[PDB]
Write a protein that binds this ligand. Structure first.
Ligand code: NDP
Ligand code: NDP
Ligand code: MMV
Ligand code: MMV
Lengths: 544, 545
């Protein structure tokens, strides 16, 4: 009898839930979880004007069918109940409210066996094509009498509630709309001991909101060229004589996902790869790390602002740092006065003395980033000197190149001034930036020589993504891709237990970055001109 | 539809071929083709002493079985013969001479059913658990009786030749041993109209020789998550919305390949991608190109020297250039006098004048590569000045870091001197190098801001690979990975047809690079300290019209 119904009839639930107003009165730093995305409808209608990509997804999922995989299902179904047209299709089940609130022109849902659960609707003022039922159970009855591929519960709040308690759902195809709307109906909370996420899609932007697609699974608690593949792997490694010390059940949730297309995984996979295959090395700091050489990450800034969601991140500091760079400053006190302590440790008397910069004032970081961006080649004296019109103003030059010669292959910003390296508190981690322009769109590649995956990298990603936006806007372009090239990529051994916790967390749709549209010159941005919207994230983690 | 015997009984050939000995035929300009690799044996034994990786491969292939796939093979063969419905093994057939060439301790071949073809010997002459058959026809009868997965013909030239003539071979698992040995027996010349290459493996080094594995095919002349995969791909392009007007048949051979693991495909695949998805842009030159932004290629220098084989490349010039860089030179005449014209066009009165370098002597390239490597920061005067001890000697610095502070994350070489750009005949294309050291091995990442896929890149790959070898050597390390990062990658429109031709050529196993081991200082290398061995390559290609 361990031959289940939702398994026999392949009943899935497909929905789309947005965020609901946190009720004017929630306590502290709003806490987030899967239940955050729960709004279904408001006043018999959808809570949002329209979201075409979900429509395209929904329609595509509920109508797709694989004929050469049906006999198997049909075989299973009769063998169980112990038992025409031929365009094999799907059963799309709805509630009255649901069916009613669907616009005229769309019913019956094209290429789908339309079914409707109402206690007052009658099959006569209807067709036959469109079936009608009495209660949950008169549905299973109608499927044993039909030829359908899969059955999808399109729903309504009630329809979802009844099908979940009645354990008649195999999978839930859940769309996460990352924006808020007022709603009077919600999707029942999903007990994580009952259902678990096995796949997360890529992140997209549709109708001025980001969204992604996840999949819930009911928890279980010519092949000559298929062989040729095995042959070509004759020399592979892992008899799992294992490697570093990292156990299986450590990344249980992480390894149990089938499809991990969320962009955040580009960052998580690198961490996993360093933990699993990294080389043990001693380091300038004496803590010990796991490192590898050469990784690439690509984020589509036209679809989302890649602020990591698997832990909390703050941006004031890094934005002030960026504005500090653009001004061409080298005075660490400017930042310290605004309580941005990113460079504090690099400006202490002791750190400077260790760099053999005995004649450098505390917090005078030398000819670093800012100085190189606006005065490459100028003679550095001290952080208070007047460097106006001295050296090569690279920033200004790249903006001009982007504006008057966008197909140039010399649009680069380089902070690595070989001649000045020793005079710097420390050489730049972010070596250079290259820009690319095509069809009104700007892409950027940043090469980083040293990457602290646990603490630094998340911030680096946000920093250059913001910077790409800034440059795009003051050049009348739309930002496209940000490409992060990592040279020496490492994970500090003291960050391992924290990163393990982070890898087993499932990303949320990304937030979006909004810049004051009025700013038209690279030098006119101020901290109030940046806004992060819809940042849904997991709780904070101290890496150490 | 007349079900062929080789398909019903799954009969395959597996061999290993080296290059044969013609001698000093005309090695300077000799021609290569698939028939280049054809040496099977010599004096009743193998031409070589022991290529262990091939042994491993040969063993993995001939003894591997997939149990769950047999029930269907059992049906197929029973159906055919009109019949009905210990551990599973494969059948291996070998000519008598072949059987006798194998060392006793390996016979019978482990975990495989052994079959020997012979007329002069019968079962009484063998102590081993083996089947003796005196006709090919008897093998078929035998395969009809036995329970086995697949049947592999290990041959002898006599055995290979006869199974091919009878059209009993479904696929040929062919190892290309890229080295020359004395031979007396050879694999039959494969007919291209009968067998086509469908797969090529990664390239490896074993017992002092590179080798790869290719597969020839006989020509005709959970599962609910499988659905989720379709769902997540709902937003993928239309077939008509794939950019450029490039044609199908134009990449017929290229796209017929099932497995393209040869490292050269990293290059070839980038070219394909740019032709299929590149952006049409004009450029500083006028020709116009197809460009994309950001690619990465990785080459394992410990397994091979990545010199492209789908077209001929000469290394004398780029080696001379590299030595020229290391000496810190900026004088173009130095290369011209060695008949290397790589920098000629960028040193003409005309080109220099167009760069506003009116006061620059012809061929005086300015503070480019070499100068930045040995004197970054120094004031450039002219190509004849003595720059000793001026500027930062980056090259010496990175060599000292690799030696005394190997875990440093600051081992970078940078030619992009922002202040000297305009004084340079032209800005550097290969912007920087970053080195990485672990367990006595040196890896290198080079970032290229602008890349001419058609002409530039093939030479750049070779250049830095040689440079990684040189640095590694003078630092007592072994070279590892050369990682090439491309920024603006483009293909000049005038190169498209030549590249269409290259993309349909199958790579050959890479050659190897040997450096005079006595050289221990980076500045002490001379052109003669470099030798490229076993470079098997396709015909030279004029990228131009
Ligand atoms: N975000 C999403 O993915 C989706 C959102 N929606 C939104 O949800 C809202 C509709 O939800 P809601 O009001 O809960 O309505 P439902 O769509 O769940 O329909 C409820 C109605 O279905 C009938 N019904 C309920 N239970 C049973 C039963 N056991 N047997 C027979 N009939 C039954 C009743 O009809 P009767 O009164 O005649 O007895 C009932 O009032 C809308 O705003 C719609 O736009 C809808 C689908 C998907
Ligand atoms: N590089 C590689 O992958 C391989 C290389 N080799 C090399 O090849 C050489 C051996 O090849 P080669 O000389 O061609 O010999 P083979 O190994 O093909 O053996 C030929 C002999 O096998 C027998 N034979 C072949 N066909 C038939 C048939 N139809 N009926 C009956 N007997 C048959 C005969 O045995 P008999 O004379 O007793 O009647 C015959 O003279 C060796 O140097 C070996 O090392 C071998 C296999 C693989
Ligand atoms: C809001 C879309 C939607 N999206 C997801 N991921 N799941 C649902 N269950 C769902 O709702 C389906 C119920 C209502 O469907 C519609 C509501 C308004 C217009 C059109 C349609 C469906 C059109 C179609 O299928 O062609
Ligand atoms: C050179 C090895 C070899 N390699 C390939 N790719 N194909 C062959 N047909 C082949 O030859 C197989 C014939 C004889 O095999 C041997 C010759 C000498 C020593 C050991 C063995 C085989 C040992 C084994 O299979 O365990």
């Amino acid at each position: 009898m361990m031959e289940q119904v939702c398994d026999v009839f392949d009943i899935y639930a497909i929905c789309a839930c947005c965020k609901v107003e946190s009720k004017n009165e929630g306590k502290k730093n709003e806490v987030f979880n899967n239940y955050t995305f729960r709004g279904l409808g408001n006043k018999g209608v959808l809570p949002w004007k329209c979201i075409s990509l979900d429509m395209k997804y929904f329609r595509a999922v509920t109508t797709y069918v694989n004929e050469s995989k049906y006999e198997k299902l049909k075989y299973k179904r009769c063998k169980y109940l112990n038992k025409n047209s031929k365009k094999l299709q799907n059963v799309v089940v709805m509630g009255r409210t649901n069916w009613e609130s669907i616009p005229k022109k769309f019913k019956p849902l094209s290429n789908r066996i339309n079914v409707i659960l109402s206690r007052t609707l009658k099959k006569e003022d209807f067709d036959e094509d469109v079936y009608i039922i009495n209660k949950v159970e008169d549905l299973i009855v109608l499927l044993g009498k039909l030829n359908y591929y899969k059955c999808f519960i399109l729903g309504g709040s009630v329809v979802y509630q009844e099908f979940l308690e009645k354990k008649l759902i195999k999978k839930i195809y859940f769309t996460r709309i990352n924006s808020t709307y007022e709603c009077d109906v919600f999707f029942p909370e999903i007990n994580e001991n009952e259902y678990q996420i096995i796949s997360v899609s890529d992140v997209y932007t549709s109708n001025n909101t980001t969204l992604d697609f996840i999949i819930y699974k009911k928890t279980n608690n010519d092949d000559e060229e298929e062989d040729d593949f095995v042959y070509f792997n004759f020399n592979k490694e892992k008899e799992e004589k294992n490697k570093n010390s990292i156990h299986p059940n450590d990344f249980q949730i992480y390894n149990s996902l089938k499809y991990k297309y969320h962009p955040e995984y580009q960052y998580l996979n690198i961490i996993y790869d360093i933990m699993m295959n990294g080389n043990k090395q001693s380091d300038r700091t004496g803590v010990g790390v796991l490192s590898k050489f050469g990784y690439i990450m690509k984020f589509d800034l036209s679809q989302y602002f890649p602020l990591l969601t698997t832990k909390k991140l703050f941006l004031r500091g890094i934005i002030e740092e960026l504005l500090w760079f653009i001004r061409g400053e080298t005075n660490g006190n400017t930042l310290l006065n605004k309580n941005v302590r990113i460079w504090e440790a690099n400006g202490t008397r002791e750190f400077l003395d260790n760099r053999k910069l005995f004649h450098r004032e505390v917090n005078d970081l030398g000819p670093i980033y800012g100085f190189q961006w606006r005065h490459f080649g100028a003679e550095y004296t001290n952080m208070y000197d007047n460097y106006e019109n001295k050296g090569v103003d690279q920033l200004k030059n790249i903006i001009n190149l982007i504006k008057n010669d966008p197909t140039s292959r010399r649009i680069l910003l380089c902070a690595w001034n070989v001649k000045d390296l020793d005079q710097m508190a420390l050489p730049p981690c972010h070596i250079l930036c290259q820009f690319y322009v095509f069809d009104g769109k700007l892409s950027c590649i940043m090469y980083q020589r040293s990457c602290d995956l646990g603490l630094g990298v998340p911030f680096n990603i946000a920093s250059y993504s913001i910077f790409t936006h800034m440059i795009a806007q003051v050049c009348n372009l739309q930002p496209a891709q940000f490409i992060h090239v990592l040279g020496n990529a490492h994970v500090y051994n003291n960050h391992i237990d924290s990163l393990k916790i982070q890898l087993n967390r499932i990303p949320y749709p990304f937030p979006t970055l909004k810049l004051n549209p009025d700013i038209k010159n690279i030098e006119d941005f101020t901290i109030s001109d940046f806004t992060i919207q819809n940042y849904v994230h997991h709780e904070k983690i101290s890496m150490d």
